[model samples]
Target: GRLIYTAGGYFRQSLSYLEAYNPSNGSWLRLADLQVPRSGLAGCVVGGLLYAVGGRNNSPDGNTDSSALDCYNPMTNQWSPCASMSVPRNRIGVGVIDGHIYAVGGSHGCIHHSSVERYEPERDEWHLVAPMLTRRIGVGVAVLNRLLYAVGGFDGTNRLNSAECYYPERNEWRMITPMNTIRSGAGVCVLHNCIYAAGGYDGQDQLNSVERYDVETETWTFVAPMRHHRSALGITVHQGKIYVLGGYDGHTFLDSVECYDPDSDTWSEVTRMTSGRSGVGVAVT
Candidate 1:
């Protein structure tokens, strides 16, 4: 199963799935555009349904935005409004577990926040969850098995190295071992019983290094680095491979794409996207 990824633009800026095969060769089809044209939002898929969270219109720091939560049904190729979050935010990370969607830390008006909220599609209602241990923007959130993992992100003053996990049943966050390197604006996903964190900003530089988290040992081990260093990268997993999409390279926005194979801990390049954007959403069908 493979899906398309749309890169949303930022200040007029911008922003994966499985091994996006080349259908001509019995592989994944190449990709397409998001129905909505915006960035600084999060993406998640629930029961084969895709959702996009709040996003701004123009500026990466633009105050002009929407509170809309758009849901996309690949089967029908349609997008519609769903319930909104408690607050409007951009640059946040979203995930799904047990049929409920989780909207984690994000920012509004240049202020980084620790707010965490969950939405129930059945009731179209939002529920407050435990806030992140750290107030941040551009955080990486993921779920492995049932535990929610929150990785390195930035505070107002600097990028972070701290990582934590929230057990929904326990309703509390426990500090997990921090990343070996401090990074912000990275992408993450869960596969093969491990969490993979990739491509982020280490304040002065964009990073290409990747790391894997072992659930059984609660520790991290290094993996192969990416071909490019990108901040604000978007990530998704399909067919057991992790794909990294659009992001920034400091001098310019990026439309480059690549994927990681856990079995080999190696990365391979893929087709370039049409736009150089960061902060876009990713999903597959």
Candidate 2:
């Protein structure tokens, strides 16, 4: 049975929690604690294993950006450190392509970054890739037509509305049509012929709105809005429906879940999470 795994996230501060949601049973299985507490990290599957990429620990006396990486084996139910990145980053975006995981722009301390890197599992090495067109943090990433996209986020001075996609064959990035509004900490996933970007922070409000990018037209269009305002949520397509998990509104971390049906053009409340969270790393495998 395939499971949807959610790793470390920020409740009030960073958490090392790891849990898996079983759609088959509608129950959550508490897994192992992350080797290191991580938040603002990225999660994706690579070679049948789950990888937790770079994030930061906000714990007292441990306030530092994490360049470390960890991989989780479900068969073993444990997490272990893999090769660390050359540069420390948090609030990153990650996507898996050709059995390789690519970590995109994120911030560290006072600086936002444009740099990106790719991890090779066979060699256990991280190699730098071309930088993005803009410096961004808290960004969302997803794959389409074998291209990895970097969506809106805060670029030091302001939240962004622009987006871009990378072509690994050329090791380069090119601009795509910008989004309708600036979005940071959004839940983004590829569903069918479109990439659905839902619920995230605009400049002032945690949004309930959703927008989709069509690969055929290469344009963004607004879809139905969610029932609740949320940002830093977890989203993925499961059994022909979009399941969105925990996130933060303006005041509190949320455990509520919402399912979106593209065919019906509506969002319905679904099973809730075990605990409230924000800045979480979510993956399906």
Candidate 3:
């Protein structure tokens, strides 16, 4: 049976948490943790193996980069280190298209804020690509029609409503329409052939807002908001719907899950995780 996976995150800084929930069996199982603890990393399945991309090194300091990349083989339940990313990053956005993984915005210090990198599994290498127009951290990334989309995150100055799309063939980024509102730490995923930017923080408040981007029309519009205002939540497309996992409210960390239905444009509460989670990596395979 398939499973839902969520890895290291912010609050549980060095958790090195590698958890899986198989809905078919309702079993919460533990897998081998990362060789090195990390948070704000991107985790996704590629060629049937799971990859933990550049994230801040997991530690109380959690500010330095963890450029080292790790690949997890479910068959052996073991993690093997791969070529590290060129930039040590926190809250990096990543998406896979044409079997290649693209690493987008996230910053350790400052210079790499608009930096972008693409990974080639065959070479176990990451190469620099065109930088984004806007410097963003806490960005959300997903691929649709072979084009990679980077959603909202905080620029150094403000929580952003901006977004951009990358055309691999062109190796260039084109500015997409701005979102409805400024947001950072937004949960993003692709569903219904459109990109969705879910709850995130907007400077003053944690957000319950969600919006969608239509590539064809170059437009963005509001959709149903999540049941709870969540920032740094884990969002992924599973079973044809958008599933948002644990995140932080303005006051406390959340342990809940919510699912979205595009057909009806609504969100509904689901199950809860065993513990609170925010900024956790989430994916399905």
Candidate 4:
């Protein structure tokens, strides 16, 4: 009930390795590797499968965007290919609801993309959906109150503070309250109906600051800061707590991990990863 999934990312270089963390004993177990090496991928769990989609193939510049869609089944310890996206992209925002996976805005090499697509697992097909109003890369996405939200990210030129939400029934995207601080590569997760945005890089610096969004008030308030300032970290929800693990802090690659409890509004250090990593993918079942 508390298994967490983390996959492909840059640990010095692009990696295809996947890992699972068990909070019960603070241990990480390696799982099957991805078919292709990648980083900056988006991952989420839907209908008992972990889906990793649209990331760059091995190249440090992040120019090698891919359209690959891969799924992992822990029970079988296997990875399988699915239908690819219409466009090649990396650093995208992914969300799931009603048995469908939504792949949102991401960059295609030099260009920031605004397109969106939906995948139906039963049909094994991808359908074009209403595009987001703003093009983004490295955005944080989550589902809150049945609405899919696209949070802070970079637009190729500037770090953005703007945010928007998608209404599935209407097939529409609407601008919502912006985050108080601009961030790119921030980790986002929804817990207890509130959206939490954690450590990321502003245009200027890696930030340790964190914030929470109140859906009822349409406002954001600061929360306890993280133990480390991380960009490209993994964010996963487990047992109503947020676990943030492994990223770069400008100078050093980090293996440190931390967890935030909303009920107490505090952070506590967890067992460190075995090795330092950045741009790691994380998902929880």
Candidate 5:
């Protein structure tokens, strides 16, 4: 059921989308391009709609922020601009549940934020939601059984392992079990009722560790680490597999893609990405 999605291209750096792949045949089909160039962003698919949130423009070191809300409709084979977030955030957390989009923390300039917001597609508007207990940039967000979970990120100075969960019904957040190691620029997604947190830098070293949180027990259990250490990697769940896409390894950028299958308890290499870049976004089409 996977379809096509495009990447934002910049003037200096090259950018292109993965041709829609026929996993069975290992072939590809070209798709459209992104409206604006960007990186370090977050993405999520809800009710067949793909939404890409705030991210950095061109250079990862650049402070320019993008507030654009780009929406992809596969049925119509088009992308449309949606209402922008209340605050501009690059590397924000995006997840959808109950037809609402949850957009969480990201940095603007040198400042990090804990502020959170939700988007209602039906009303075409944004609403302020409960803030994260810990303010961090590059935090990972996911929805498990209707609860929003905000995971590891940086606090401007240090990377964090702390995580918190929010209940929209009660409009409150509670502290959850934290990761084994402090990390930011990692990817977190829910599969088989467990939350998986994968690769990122730990201040000094780039990591390959992947851990999972048990929703029922409120605890974290270690999983198989990745084959490579990549931060800013785009992580998402597709067809029961965990796809970890492009990011930097502290020294150089990467376009390699890999998949993790919990059933096999192993990580396997996938087709190389079309370009060598970090801070890329991913969503199953």
Candidate 6:
């Protein structure tokens, strides 16, 4: 049952390819391709179904951001279109809480935004929700103890270090302690009660730094850094270990992979992907 899924991403060009990793065997297997070629998409798994949200489509001139929503059924190895997002955006942060999928901040073309929206699978509709406090793109969102956390990203003007949590019961977002380093395109995941933010692009350079936020203490502490300085990587928790997938390191796209163990507070390299990638979407089912 411990598996990680990586969807569309950008290499030499936007990709529609899908792949899965089995930690048990330390192997990767190609999955069915996505219906549309896109990059910077967001994804989540609910009730054994994987949903891919809005991302930039493969337009030759590169002006099209898409509102496309597509669903994948692993049981059948098939994909079907779902209701598109209300706004077209790329680099969105997505999370699932109480059976609803939330798509958070992203950029439309060159404009950063703080907009938030939720999807009701039963109704097949997308509805507006309380927006994040800061307008950001390339942010990462994860759910812990029933709360949605929006982590660092760029705000069109500068790289950001700010973080916030959403209380769905009150439909509001509250600021949290900022990360130690300003970063954009980081990967985030919840391991037990702590939220870990991994490799990303700092204001000036690509970073291999990592930090963990304690939900109960409301504090952030630095952790073991990744093997590579990766931005736009995909991260997920499988069998209590944080698996970081393909991303860019300023010079080139990466196929290198690594995992972090909380018990040891250490990072170790793992099996690499078949091809280098950045802006990849990930889901665990």
| 2 against 3, candidate with superior lDDT | 2
TM, every model: 0.89, 0.97, 0.95, 0.97, 0.92, 0.97
Distance from true location, Cα of 241 in model 4, Å:
0.2
lDDT of 1 by residue, 1-285 (tens): 456544354525432221233312434433334554667777777777778886666634645554558777666656777887878777787788898988877777777778889899889888898888888778888898888888888878878888889899988888899898787889888878898889899878999898989988988888999998988887888788888887887777777778888888789877676556777766655
TM-score of 4: 0.97
lDDT (C-alpha) at residue 87 in model 1: 81
Poorly placed runs, candidate 3 (over 4 Å): 110-112
How accurate locally is residue 34 in candidate 4, as Cα lDDT from 0 to 100?
93
Ranking by lDDT: 6, 2, 4, 3, 5, 1
Mark the regions of model 1 whose C-alpha exceeds 4 Å error after superposition: 14-36, 59-62
Judging by lDDT, tell me the better candidate of 2 and 4.
Answer: 2
Better of 5 and 6 by TM-score: 6
Q: Kindly list the per-residue Cα lDDT of model 6 for residues 1-285, writing each as its tens digit.
A: 457899999887789888999988988879899988888998789889988888787557664787888999998999999999888879888999999999998988887889999999999999999988999899999899889999999888978999999999999999999999887899988998899999888878888999999988888999888889999998999888999988999898999889898899998988988999898889888
- The reply for model 5, stretches above 4 Å from the true place, is 4-6, 9-19, 59-63
lDDT of 5 by residue, 140-179 (tens): 8888989999999998877899999999999989988888
Across 1-285, the per-residue lDDT of candidate 4 in tens digits comes to 578778888876788878888999988898899998888888888888999988787666655787888999989999999999999878887888898999988878788988899999999999999999988899989998779999999887878988899999999999989999998899988988888899888999998999989888999989999999999888988998999988889899888889998889899998787778777778887
lDDT of 2: 0.88
Query: Which lDDT values do the candidates have, in the order given?
Result: 0.76, 0.88, 0.83, 0.88, 0.78, 0.89
- Which residue pairs overlap in candidate 2's backbone? none
- Stretches of candidate 6 off by over 4 Å are 58-61
* Candidate 2 C-alpha error for residue 99, in Å: 0.5
What does candidate 2 score on TM? 0.97
TM-score of 1: 0.89
